[PDB]
Amino acid sequence: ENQKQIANQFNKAISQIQESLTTTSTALGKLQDVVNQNAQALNTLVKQLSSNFGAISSVLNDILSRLDKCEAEVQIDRLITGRLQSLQTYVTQQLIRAAEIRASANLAATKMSECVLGQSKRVDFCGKGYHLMSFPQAAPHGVVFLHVTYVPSQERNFTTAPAICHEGKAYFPREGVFVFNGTSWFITQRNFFSPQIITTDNTFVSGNCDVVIGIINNTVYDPL
Amino acid sequence: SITTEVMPVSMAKTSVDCNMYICGDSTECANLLLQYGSFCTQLNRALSGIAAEQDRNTREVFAQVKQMYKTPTLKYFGGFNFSQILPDPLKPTKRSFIEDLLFNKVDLICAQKFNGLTVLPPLLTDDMIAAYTAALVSGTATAGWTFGAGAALQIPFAMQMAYRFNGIGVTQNVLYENQKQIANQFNKAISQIQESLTTTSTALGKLQDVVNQNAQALNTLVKQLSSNFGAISSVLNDILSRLDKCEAEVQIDRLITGRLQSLQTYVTQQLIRAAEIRASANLAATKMSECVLGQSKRVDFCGKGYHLMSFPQAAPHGVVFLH
Amino acid sequence: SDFTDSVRDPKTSEILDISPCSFGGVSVITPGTNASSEVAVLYQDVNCTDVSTAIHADQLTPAWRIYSTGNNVFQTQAGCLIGAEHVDTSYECDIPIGAGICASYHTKSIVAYTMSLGADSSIAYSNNTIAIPTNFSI
Amino acid sequence: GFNTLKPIFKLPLGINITNFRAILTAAYFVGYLKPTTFMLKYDENGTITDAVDCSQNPLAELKCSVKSFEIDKGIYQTSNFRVVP
Ligand SMILES: *[C@@H]1O[C@H](CO)[C@@H](O)[C@H](O)[C@H]1NC(C)=O
Ligand SMILES: *[C@@H]1O[C@H](CO)[C@@H](O)[C@H](O)[C@H]1NC(C)=O
Ligand SMILES: *[C@@H]1O[C@H](CO)[C@@H](O)[C@H](O)[C@H]1NC(C)=O
Ligand SMILES: *[C@@H]1O[C@H](CO)[C@@H](O)[C@H](O)[C@H]1NC(C)=O
Ligand SMILES: *[C@@H]1O[C@H](CO)[C@@H](O)[C@H](O)[C@H]1NC(C)=O
Ligand SMILES: *[C@@H]1O[C@H](CO)[C@@H](O)[C@H](O)[C@H]1NC(C)=O
Ligand SMILES: *[C@@H]1O[C@H](CO)[C@@H](O)[C@H](O)[C@H]1NC(C)=O
Ligand SMILES: *[C@@H]1O[C@H](CO)[C@@H](O)[C@H](O)[C@H]1NC(C)=O
């Protein structure tokens, strides 16, 4: 009934993403931190070659240049031990960081499986609101999902009843709730306000109206 | 039936002073420690990252509502007694009755402060974690599925359980003909938790194990200062008291290497432990997102049986769900 | 740990405690060097009545004695914060200090406040009413 | 102000020097050196063009703890450069 103004909201929401992406530069902070961490670790590994670890000098061609093959064994061995344990520290930190990156990659893979190739009913897994569809985009060492969602707005107050009874038989709704306008009782779905006249077809009968708490008398239209 | 599920969120935030641990108040050992350049900054960076990650876990599990709902004055919603999991206005505590039952079941610290080991306090206090969970329980009773899906929409609590019976394939009229029976069973299942939480102490073991592991690691880090690593003695003020500047260079440089590798072993163990705690915190975040704010159809994700709703409660370094 | 705590004086035969010269923790809060050159100093796990004794403030330069006692003293559950003007109202968190206190650079000076959890609101509960949306957004 | 001092000359004369006395034919100022911790910056010529004293300010202690002259916004933990036995 209103396809034209839904398509205008989807064209406007796509356009507002560029106006957010062009101006700022801190929206992709989860991708710059990976680059910073790797570059910092590798630069520290380079800068730890200037330490001497208790030897006479940090330069290996300075121990060999002024000591024979006889006293320079202990200094070279101290330097080798220090540089080996520095390299092992770097590899251990890299292994732990690879583990956390793999955890995030598995999450991205299952999000792509369950939200791009289909529609997911898991709450807040793929955006805020009720999920409709999704679009993947690439990014430097990463992926960016554009989750499109339906969000209700402009709530309205009503007074409601759990059931009604026409001739001593309780009529429960099939889908939706009973609501009360200025003069009459209607039946509505809960995520939109489309008030439909109450009919025998969309309500079902179970029991008498002497045990349900808070039942309100009305009449049920019959297609006859 | 109401089933409890306990899971950890964050662990203790710690930080070590490298110069105080390796060479405590010794000027000669400090000048010998600057030769091992860029070896304590690389370690304090890791520990600070761990601490910030712990604060992020605590924020991300609980702060899932942008809007804070006040607890209603009436705690009786259509026959279901909610007064046992919501804060009591007359009582002096700002926590639920069940949360108070959870906070009670979970010469060594002096030697830690002297050697540069400090435990930082958490950013969100226990009165703000327990003020978040009084806005998720009170939003679940007065509103429904939509306070996490958008604007909060008011609904009676009898009509919220009729939609939650439609989610499991049972018609609406099953609720309304015997609403009093279900309301009596829901009051009884809440009361049976307190008779189980008060007596035993083997329910919050997953939260006690975290405390035990962190305290044991820190105490072993302290107790490894008494080793000498092949030097003449383990006391740095005993080598410097009786050895000149020519002989004590090789004796000090055996203590510095051993204490450095002991600190590095502690930091590696803490990094792996922080990884597994973060995995548990991510599971807690998605369980709160998918089972408190809505109704889940995933089998045995949120209890045994067909899920209806859920309530979160705070606990020392963790969260307790009542599915 | 093999660290001497007490020692006996060989002449007067009394007992003396030995403790480290500066034990504890000190933290510095900055708005950035390119923003200003003022700082705020936090002493951890130290009651702020005896911060001057635990730092040995008598043997310091006069630029350290203005971060030891003044009219800008705040006492948090982390410790004592000196240099930050306490404000009663609450905003979002900018610099996480600990135990519910944050600090920021406001109007300029460094202020320390309690962090705000979220927007304060309320929804009424009535047993015969409902709220149903009428419009939507994509 | 600020002015770095270049080395003119070192003399191999082995005596104790505990007094001195200027020789005049204006004013002069005498200050004594103390053992402290500085952080010095060397440019591409090989000259000291900036220096910070780690025992003066909490900000300077922070600058020496991070080992930089530019500090980003946040809370940092600093070492002990303020007290000497
Ligand atoms: C519904 O009524 C309540 C009080 O009866 C009021 O506070 C609320 O704003 C109303 N809802 C709307 C959407 O106006
Ligand atoms: C719905 O309720 C409003 C109340 O303002 C009333 O004006 C309107 O006529 C009602 N709808 C119908 C179809 O009667
Ligand atoms: C709603 O609550 C009011 C006040 O407690 C009560 O008078 C009324 O009977 C209730 N109505 C229903 C349908 O429960
Ligand atoms: C709800 O349970 C508490 C538990 O002691 C009880 O004190 C209170 O009266 C109950 N509320 C009722 C019966 O409305
Ligand atoms: C040792 O010398 C001190 C200093 O004069 C004196 O006070 C003390 O009486 C002497 N004797 C003993 C047994 O300490
Ligand atoms: C307040 O200062 C006293 C001084 O000794 C100290 O014992 C006490 O623990 C301090 N209070 C707190 C809460 O730390
Ligand atoms: C919903 O909002 C849009 C724009 O805000 C408006 O054009 C439309 O008429 C609204 N729907 C109704 C039913 O009024
Ligand atoms: C270094 O010396 C060269 C030649 O004297 C000069 O051109 C250059 O500017 C100097 N570097 C700096 C930083 O001034």
Numbering used by the authors:
A (entry chain B): 900 to 1123
B (entry chain C): 703 to 808, 830 to 1046
C (entry chain B): 556 to 662, 672 to 702
D (entry chain B): 212 to 236, 250 to 309
Text lifted from the article:
Among structural proteins of Sarbecoviruses, spike (S) protein is responsible for receptor binding and mediates membrane fusion between cell and virus to initiate infection. RBDs in SARS-CoV-1 spikes were observed to be in the “up” and “down” positions making the spikes exhibit open and closed conformations, respectively. We introduced these three disulfide bonds in equivalent positions in the SARS-CoV-1 S sequence generating three spike variants: S/x1 (S370C and D967C), S/x2 (G400C and V969C), and S/x3 (D414C and V969C). We determined cryo-EM structures of SARS-CoV-1 S/x1, S/x2, and S/x3 spikes and we identified various previously undetected conformations for SARS-CoV-1 S through classification procedures.
By cryo-EM, only symmetrical S-trimers were observed for SARS-CoV-1 S/x2 and S/x3 spikes. The S/x2 spike adopts symmetrical locked-2 and closed conformations. The S/x2 locked-2 spike protomer displays cryo-EM density showing an ordered 602–619 region in Domain D, highly similar to S/x1 locked-2 spike protomer. Surprisingly, the lipid-binding pocket is unoccupied even though the entrance to the pocket is closed by the gating helix. In the locked-2 conformation, the highly dynamic region between residues 602–627 in Domain D (Domain D-loop) undergoes drastic refolding to adopt a fully ordered “Domain D-loop conformation-1” with several mini-helices within the loop. A change of Domain C–D hinge region structure allows residues R306 and F578 to interact with W619 and the Domain D hydrophobic core by cation–π and hydrophobic interactions, respectively. These interactions likely still rigidify this region to maintain the more tightly packed locked-2 conformation. Under native conditions, x2 disulfide is more resistant to reduction by DTT than x1 and x3 disulfides, likely reflecting different local chemical environments for different disulfides.
